[PDB]
Design a protein around this ligand. Sequence first.
Ligand SMILES: Cn1cc(-c2cc(-c3cc(Cl)c(F)c(OCc4ccccc4Cl)c3)c(=O)n(-c3cccnc3)c2)c(=O)[nH]c1=O
Ligand SMILES: Cn1cc(-c2cc(-c3cc(Cl)c(F)c(OCc4ccccc4Cl)c3)c(=O)n(-c3cccnc3)c2)c(=O)[nH]c1=O
Ligand SMILES: [Cl-]
Ligand SMILES: [Cl-]
Lengths: 305, 305
Amino acid sequence: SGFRKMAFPSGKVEGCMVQVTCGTTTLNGLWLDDVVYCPRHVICTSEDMLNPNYEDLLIRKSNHNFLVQAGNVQLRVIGHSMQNCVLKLKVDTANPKTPKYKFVRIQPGQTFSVLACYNGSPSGVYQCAMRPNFTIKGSFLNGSCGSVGFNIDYDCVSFCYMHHMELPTGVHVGTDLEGNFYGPFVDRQTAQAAGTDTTITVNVLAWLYAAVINGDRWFLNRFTTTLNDFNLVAMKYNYEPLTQDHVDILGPLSAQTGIAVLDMCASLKELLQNGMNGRTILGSALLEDEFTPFDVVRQCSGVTF
Amino acid sequence: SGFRKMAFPSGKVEGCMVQVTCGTTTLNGLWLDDVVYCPRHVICTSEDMLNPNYEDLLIRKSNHNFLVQAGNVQLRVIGHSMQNCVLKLKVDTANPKTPKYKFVRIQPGQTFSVLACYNGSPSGVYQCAMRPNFTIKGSFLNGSCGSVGFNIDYDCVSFCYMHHMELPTGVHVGTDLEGNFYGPFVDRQTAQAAGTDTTITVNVLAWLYAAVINGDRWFLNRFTTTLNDFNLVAMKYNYEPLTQDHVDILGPLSAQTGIAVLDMCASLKELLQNGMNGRTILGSALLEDEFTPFDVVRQCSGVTF
Ligand SMILES: Cn1cc(-c2cc(-c3cc(Cl)c(F)c(OCc4ccccc4Cl)c3)c(=O)n(-c3cccnc3)c2)c(=O)[nH]c1=O
Ligand SMILES: Cn1cc(-c2cc(-c3cc(Cl)c(F)c(OCc4ccccc4Cl)c3)c(=O)n(-c3cccnc3)c2)c(=O)[nH]c1=O
Ligand SMILES: [Cl-]
Ligand SMILES: [Cl-]
């Protein structure tokens, strides 16, 4: 028992982290096979970041201007190209520590682990979620650019996130590993505000099922509801609408606990309407939405990697 | 910016995890140099666990009764001994993946990362704290025994915890790597209740400093207090007493924010006396006590390993 915000074991990603230096800039890269991936703004000076023309800036860079260090091992760069907002540096050595891997673009609401790094060196690991406004609420300081987010399934690392910028509000934005930003953000120091940060309803429901499995039952009431009625309430409290697809993804948790999904929605509706009256659920005084249904089953069943 | 419950990168410990099997039992072991460490209750049957005499049970076990598997690599056990509540299996091969390491016994209030494992395979990593009653609030299922807790300083792993049992209340108890239980617990299936779970005051103060550094300032008031007066309030709310030593450990956070420690105590006193009025601090609706002063500085400064 117990329920914790749990990250995947990070070792398979630690072995891929390198330092990339261009001119005066140093940030993190991801070394997989014979390619190193990093944010393309590694080629910018402070003044370039205000209105960079990346193709023009790249004209003035050659393979030997990119320095890649892994430990003290210095890697030899034999080619470079820009793919959307990431740079791909071809090196002459395949990373011997490369895990089975793939690149995936995740949907809002999905969670992943972040390995925060500085100077190619891992600092810590934590869990977060793609917010509905395509930001993440991470923990990142200067020098953290190029840190990656990932999921692990058995022995396969699914890289889904590369860190690029912190917005003036303190939330974090980045790309998939094909270099396409999540959401409407662009890698320029220019005004960019995030949209509404709504709550991920299916994840809250999954966490309420985790609570029940763990013995926190006080919020279970004896009401039910309908999808349309619940969604009227979701809208009022800036919750994402619940769909039939979401109901189906919660099926396994419903089967394990015997609590119909719409019954749990009725309990959530009462919690939204009356608050928690100084009580707690799984040690939290608010409703948590960064556990997916799959997170809850994995943690509550013991799945390993 | 941002502030997250952050675990150390786990890779250095992943490379040490093995499966230990005795008879019908299988749990996790820690392979460092040519020794494997695991809970001594690996030799018990279900009936033995009610009142085991471990020395007597060990009389009937030989090296070849202990099976140690690392991947599919089967290790050859060339000796065994019991040290307090752990078994030490001497194997004929040094772990090539052994990190720099040491064994430490931590004090209540200190935090560490847990690598939860099942069948010698890592499942996830999360942060927790030695509670004042010498329990931890982990996330552990059957098969998790022998999972370890640790801190990492530069390149040195400091192992502080080995998981042994879940109490009927659902909290978790274990040993240091010398096999001595934290707190009064014993490895027998017999009535054992934990003491009061008080709140770690110095850690709450550290987290309030983290909040200030991150821009959550609403709880700062214009009062101060004294150590003795604050502690009167700490006692009423089942907080641990604050000492001068604690005040000194918070000095660096005080220096960075300009907020005298006793001023922050005054803000905490008002929070304890009036609650948070539906507000949040660093995304939490309660006061968090599983960040140490050192956790806050490391996370807010970018220290790597
Ligand atoms: C040279 N250099 C630079 C960085 C680096 C760059 C950035 C960064 C990069 C680009 Cl292209 C930007 F358009 C940018 O505008 C952010 C912004 C957007 C909209 C309105 C205002 C603003 Cl200000 C920021 C960054 O946000 N961070 C960072 C800091 C704190 C936490 N997370 C990320 C770090 C680095 O890590 N290493 C290194 O060597
Ligand atoms: C054969 N076997 C056994 C275990 C295993 C053993 C235990 C376990 C071991 C011993 Cl010596 C106990 F005295 C014990 O009494 C707990 C208790 C104390 C006081 C009052 C009532 C009770 Cl019930 C429990 C366990 O607590 N857990 C566990 C389960 C869930 C979460 N965390 C830990 C697991 C294992 O992991 N693998 C494996 O093969
Ligand atoms: Cl947690
Ligand atoms: Cl967190």
